[PDB]
Design a protein around this ligand. Structure first.
Ligand SMILES: CC(=O)N[C@@H]1[C@@H](O[C@@H]2O[C@H](CO)[C@H](O)[C@H](O[C@]3(C(=O)O)C[C@H](O)[C@@H](NC(C)=O)[C@H]([C@H](O)[C@H](O)CO)O3)[C@H]2O)[C@H](O)[C@@H](CO)O[C@H]1O
Ligand SMILES: CC(=O)N[C@@H]1[C@@H](O[C@@H]2O[C@H](CO)[C@H](O)[C@H](O[C@]3(C(=O)O)C[C@H](O)[C@@H](NC(C)=O)[C@H]([C@H](O)[C@H](O)CO)O3)[C@H]2O)[C@H](O)[C@@H](CO)O[C@H]1O
Ligand SMILES: CC(=O)N[C@@H]1[C@@H](O[C@@H]2O[C@H](CO)[C@H](O)[C@H](O[C@]3(C(=O)O)C[C@H](O)[C@@H](NC(C)=O)[C@H]([C@H](O)[C@H](O)CO)O3)[C@H]2O)[C@H](O)[C@@H](CO)O[C@H]1O
Ligand SMILES: *[C@@H]1O[C@H](CO)[C@@H](O)[C@H](O)[C@H]1NC(C)=O
Ligand SMILES: *[C@@H]1O[C@H](CO)[C@@H](O)[C@H](O)[C@H]1NC(C)=O
Ligand SMILES: *[C@@H]1O[C@H](CO)[C@@H](O)[C@H](O)[C@H]1NC(C)=O
Ligand SMILES: *[C@@H]1O[C@H](CO)[C@@H](O)[C@H](O)[C@H]1NC(C)=O
Ligand SMILES: *[C@@H]1O[C@H](CO)[C@@H](O)[C@H](O)[C@H]1NC(C)=O
Ligand SMILES: *[C@@H]1O[C@H](CO)[C@@H](O)[C@H](O)[C@H]1NC(C)=O
Lengths: 175, 323, 175, 175, 323, 323
């Protein structure tokens, strides 16, 4: 991991989530369940998909070899012809193997970034109205029902609406 | 006391697929797209609507000149590409040299439509014998000759000077072929041609050739020590080819009309016909594929993936799949 | 965004700031205003500028084509000559298009990194002497005048000097 | 720095640490000392090492030039031969210089990532049982002996075991 | 109650500029630098201080030999580069072949300074006529010849054997040109040269050439069936070229002194002169540019951007510009 | 009051090593690996077990034909690679041309084992003198000839027609060399060969050559105006080479048996032997190196690093080393 999320602080991944690449697992008094963030998952599909097509398109023009015959006293240009044609095969083989190796790395770290960006989208929403456990989970200081959570997921989360309730339970564990 | 939780996490599955990275190999991943095509039908197929010329055990020279061991090909006229073995056995049955052969093979790889036409009929040779024939150019163990060129010899005991022309009436280029015979000694020369100091001269608007027999002692090839050297030219439309000779002339009976030029190829392969169709052919088999790459063979023809020497090319799409 | 800042938690960018690439917008009792961090902006100019010149320099030696004539019976070497010269044109066209596509990505994420690095330079200065709102803004628990702020910008910010005042206002919202 | 750690918030590096690339400096009542995280350091050695070998292997097949003679009337193919052979030398020289320039960048930012990932591995372990100073140091709210610390280093750190003690000292600085 | 705030943010403007990425296209950005040059003046300009040789409707052969339709060029001596059409019309006015033409054109593309000198004056031919002339090599509808080479014919009714030499006094290489005439029949041969079996032999320290007329029947080109084949060599300093002939010799009157070799080129273009200056020229126009790349045409001369086939190359400099 | 601390930090040392980046140069780093090899011993060494042929001031032609100034090389038989100067001085001592020389040099660069054998002994020439000799092919200021080919001349006052063959008994290819002499005039011809109109004809299964002297006037080279043109062929196993001549024949005495073909090379270098060993040789010196790259010279032989034109290639391994 380059960004610290995948196989980082969020140790392990969820066999349970299925409808997407990145998402949430809630756990409240009404019950649990996995739900994938389709905003961030779709942006990661449009990304990778575009990547593939671009790797293909950059390669759509490249050196095509053709058979050429030489006689017994044209060894020099025959050998020139041979080295030339291997030269381009070796060149394009290098370009393809390297482009794949490189964009593979960029792909994995992209997923890593996308997850940490999603975790941060939540953390910055909740702030002190919840506790971060260090495993990619937030423990709420207030009460989040199966309708409050859809607000933090959609980004439409009214902070002050829970702020006061939350404050009193956070300070409770003290005096 | 415990409260409501939300978590952030990521996808995992039961996926074995691996991809590679500069810094780490064999990364087990979630989803992956293979982009390298590594299988072929192993067959020489038609290319779109059109079938290849498979020369079998003949060579381009053998076919064009009409080696008797190649009569199969006396009337081919349309192909997609040409297949010729590494070392065909039936080329020049009478030992000799084919001038600018590779340039002709190359010229041929830009042509997909011949129409063989009769340019000088044997009827013309009213004062020469046309029955010249050899045991090297032998058919059913009975001495024969090249089907498309005629071995002129003395009639009675004379060889009158030849002067014959042909004008390219058509609107296509014309490939004419001729030759000269190199005898072993002055005796043999006189026995075939009477005349003792000979020439063959060919003239067009561009060509200006003068050939002269070379009597010398040579090693035996197919039991013969004599030789026969062939030559070709492209006769453009509305131009005339002019032969003059007083002996040793191997005259053209047939010429080839060049009806369609297209992108083509001469492939070296040991395979036979495949009776199948494709959009992409290689010397070792055809390709039915959508992959952007393949690694089967560099020499391809038709709309194909790009060749690389890689044995493996796979893109990661999904994320690292933790055990 | 790869680092989460640009069009991330700092949603949207400031038409108002102009003197630089990255910077601050303050808002106190004396008044407001945009100011660009010239430390981080200049380091991003020296970076990109060097990048351009290096892309140009790596390309300053590359294959130059030359006209060559062949006659009617030199078709093979003419065709060899043609494929060879297209080969290099296709090769260098690939290298340039790909190098640009790649370094473009690296450029945008660089700006993204530079912003998140600047946000973090502030967050780690203030700590609990202020509140993070989740939009790239810090609400001060103490009083920051148009001279206290220039300290956090220059990095020269005396934490204990405000620590005590700050503590009492942060705990005020409780008991 | 792309990730903000190296020559970022962790300003300067430790001449004192020696047994590894990334690690800790503790300071308690029993005494001090540097110790390198061998988990993260070894993963960075296996990474870079693999990188080198892969750069070498991708280059193990590439164009080899060969001497060819031409006479006084083969100037055209001699010149063709010359341009062809320079073409590949210029091509492979570009590929090597660029691959090195690129992977160098990726290498430094990798170290940067590895450090910030290590800092975060600690921060998320401690949480409110300690204070982050903004310089890459954590001040403990509880008592960490030369045996408690080896727990946070090995990742085996029992949070609730110190949670209660810690809470009372953190709230002490208030009422 | 609300307190003092500080914020972190980033630059934005009213910028339409887009750049491209592997993962996303048409990213609206803040600042961008275009690095591809996509415009040319469309003119054949001087190259620095020096003007091109624009051959117009002549070919290199036509110019060097002195086709009468090319008298414009009888005294060129200094150029930057050469421009020649795809299919010039005035090359060899008398139908023939120019031996090793492409090798000479290539040799010429390394030369930017000729000085035409008189190597064998017509005065020398005291026992031969120098008035050989044809309707194909015709000027103002009145039969003429190549200006730089002389068609020797019989004087009275004899053609005495020729033996003439020239020594390269100068310290520059010398490009000498000669030729041989191929008549139609023995009759025509005797009418021009008297002598019936002829040769032209040329000797230097390196050259050892023996040419012999080829009488044959050929198609008509410019009404003629005869032919004329030309040949060239480089005569090094302090070396002597030696001609011996008894007929059919087309003798050099002028040779070309090679004063300056430089990097040059022969461009194929249909354009005329442009009366303009540049530091970078292409066959379709010149380039005034600082861009590291261009996409106008691969065949350039002078200090130029690098050619790519891209229609667009733009680097992002600034950051993503949010609407 | 202050409590226990833990910190996160990173390695630093007293390291000067720098590496480069697209965005920043001269980055002082902790550890770095240089991957470019920039030093050579400057010597022409043996290549593994085997020593090079260092021709010194001879050329391949000089060696194979036996220029008397090259007797050192009369019996070489095994090498690793060949070294020949840019402009050797001892090639064809008798001024002439070597036909298809570059193709032979190329063929030679695939051969590492000769065995010179005596194909036609001088004893054979029972009716011809074998003492043909020149002042240009002179040894200790006393007129000599090529050691491997024999200048046949008239014995008494006749030159009887030659007809000699040789069959390749061996199971290796055989490189035979011959030649023809071009005299200055009919007089000189008669003085050496008696016979006035001559030919040399060579025949194999593939070869069919007819050579004819070219009498012409030429510039003097080494005081001579005459010339001698040499030719070669590969005689396959169980095939016969056939010479016929009535004059001007330069006959083969020795042929070269091709025992081992291997990957080899002809290097242009001005250096002498080095008396040293290597696994990688260049024209300017050998390489003892593990680096994946080198920048010393493109033309290498043996297992070598990859050549680049870079003056510097260093990979960062460690991290930015703060002052
Ligand atoms: C060199 C020599 O004299 N060899 C003798 C043999 O002569 C040749 O042997 C071959 C078989 O190995 C053939 O019989 C040759 O005869 C032909 C041929 O090629 O088949 C017969 C053809 O009808 C004739 N055609 C024409 C148009 O002339 C042809 C030509 O003359 C030659 O190809 C021209 O070079 O020859 C024959 O030439 C001989 O068979 C053997 C026993 O008699 O003795 C050998 O010494
Ligand atoms: C093949 C033939 O006999 N054609 C007859 C015509 O003869 C040729 O026709 C052309 C015009 O088409 C010219 O008149 C030719 O005459 C010249 C020429 O080329 O102009 C006249 C030159 O003065 C003469 N020069 C020299 C130095 O000899 C030149 C040469 O002889 C030839 O070029 C050598 O090949 O010929 C003429 O040869 C003829 O005009 C026509 C009617 O009379 O009848 C045709 O059958
Ligand atoms: C062109 C001419 O006549 N030059 C005269 C000189 O003749 C030539 O000069 C050279 C020295 O410059 C040699 O003496 C030549 O003699 C040899 C030779 O090449 O050494 C002597 C050889 O024994 C003889 N060998 C054979 C096998 O015949 C050789 C050949 O004949 C020729 O190489 C064939 O071309 O010639 C000599 O030919 C002459 O020396 C000088 C004064 O006498 O006068 C010059 O005009
Ligand atoms: C990667 O996987 C392939 C296929 O299982 C295997 O052959 C290869 O050895 C693996 N590479 C390494 C470095 O283990
Ligand atoms: C072809 O030959 C005939 C006689 O054989 C001749 O009359 C005619 O003119 C020739 N055609 C051409 C185009 O030369
Ligand atoms: C990118 O912009 C260009 C110019 O406006 C346009 O032609 C092209 O269609 C755009 N690409 C996509 C994928 O929309
Ligand atoms: C040139 O020719 C003259 C006579 O025509 C002759 O005397 C002289 O020696 C020749 N020059 C050379 C260098 O051969
Ligand atoms: C980088 O270091 C080298 C060696 O000290 C020096 O020659 C060069 O000028 C430096 N580059 C820059 C941009 O200062
Ligand atoms: C070689 O020559 C001899 C006579 O000189 C002849 O009898 C023999 O047949 C020839 N060998 C071959 C293979 O031709």
């Amino acid at each position: 991991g380059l960004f610290g999320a995948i196989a980082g602080f969020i140790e392990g991944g969820w066999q349970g989530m299925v409808d997407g690449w990145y998402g949430y697992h809630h756990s409240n008094e009404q019950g649990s369940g996995y739900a994938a963030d389709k905003e961030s998952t779709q942006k990661a599909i449009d990304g990778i998909t575009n990547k593939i097509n671009s790797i293909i398109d950059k390669m759509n023009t490249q050196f095509e070899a053709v058979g050429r015959e030489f006689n017994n006293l044209e060894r020099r240009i025959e050998n020139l012809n041979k080295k030339m044609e291997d030269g381009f095969l070796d060149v394009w083989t290098y370009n393809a193997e390297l482009l794949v190796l490189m964009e593979n790395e960029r792909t994995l770290d992209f997923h890593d970034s996308n997850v940490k960006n999603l975790y941060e989208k939540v953390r910055l929403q909740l702030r002190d109205n919840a506790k971060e456990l260090g495993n990619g989970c937030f423990e709420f200081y207030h009460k989040c029902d199966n309708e409050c959570m859809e607000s933090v997921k959609n980004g439409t989360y009214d902070y002050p609406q829970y702020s006061e309730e939350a404050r009193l339970n956070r300070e409770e564990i003290s005096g | 006391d415990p409260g409501d939780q939300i978590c952030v996490g990521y996808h995992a599955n039961n996926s074995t697929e691996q991809v590679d990275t500069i810094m780490e190999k064999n990364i087990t991943v979630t989803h992956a797209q293979d982009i390298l095509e590594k299988t072929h039908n192993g067959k020489l197929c038609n290319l779109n609507g059109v079938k290849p010329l498979i020369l079998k055990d003949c060579s381009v020279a053998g076919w064009l000149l009409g080696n008797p061991m190649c009569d199969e090909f006396l009337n081919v006229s349309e192909w997609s590409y040409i297949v010729e073995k590494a070392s065909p056995a039936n080329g020049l049955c009478y030992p000799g040299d084919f001038n600018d052969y590779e340039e002709l093979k190359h010229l041929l790889s830009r042509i997909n439509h011949f129409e063989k036409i009769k340019i000088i009929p044997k009827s013309y040779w009213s004062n020469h014998e046309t029955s010249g024939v050899s045991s090297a150019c032998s058919y059913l163990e009975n001495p024969s000759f090249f089907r498309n060129v005629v071995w002129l010899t003395k009639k009675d005991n004379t060889y009158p000077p030849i002067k014959v022309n042909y004008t390219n009436a058509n609107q296509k280029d014309l490939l004419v072929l001729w030759g000269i015979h190199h005898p072993n000694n002055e005796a043999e020369q006189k026995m075939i041609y009477q005349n003792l100091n000979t020439y063959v001269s060919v003239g067009t608007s561009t060509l200006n050739q003068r050939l002269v027999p070379k009597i010398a002692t040579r090693s035996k090839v197919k039991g013969l020590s004599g030789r026969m050297d062939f030559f070709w030219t492209i006769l453009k439309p509305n131009d005339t080819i002019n032969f003059d000779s007083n002996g040793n002339f191997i005259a053209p009976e047939y010429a080839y009309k060049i009806v369609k030029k297209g992108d083509s190829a001469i492939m070296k392969s040991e395979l036979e016909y495949g009776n199948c169709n494709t959009k992409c052919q290689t010397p070792i088999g055809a390709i039915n594929s959508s992959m952007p790459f393949h690694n089967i063979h560099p020499l391809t023809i038709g709309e194909c993936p790009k060749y690389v020497k890689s044995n493996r090319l796979v893109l990661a799409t999904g994320l690292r799949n933790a055990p």
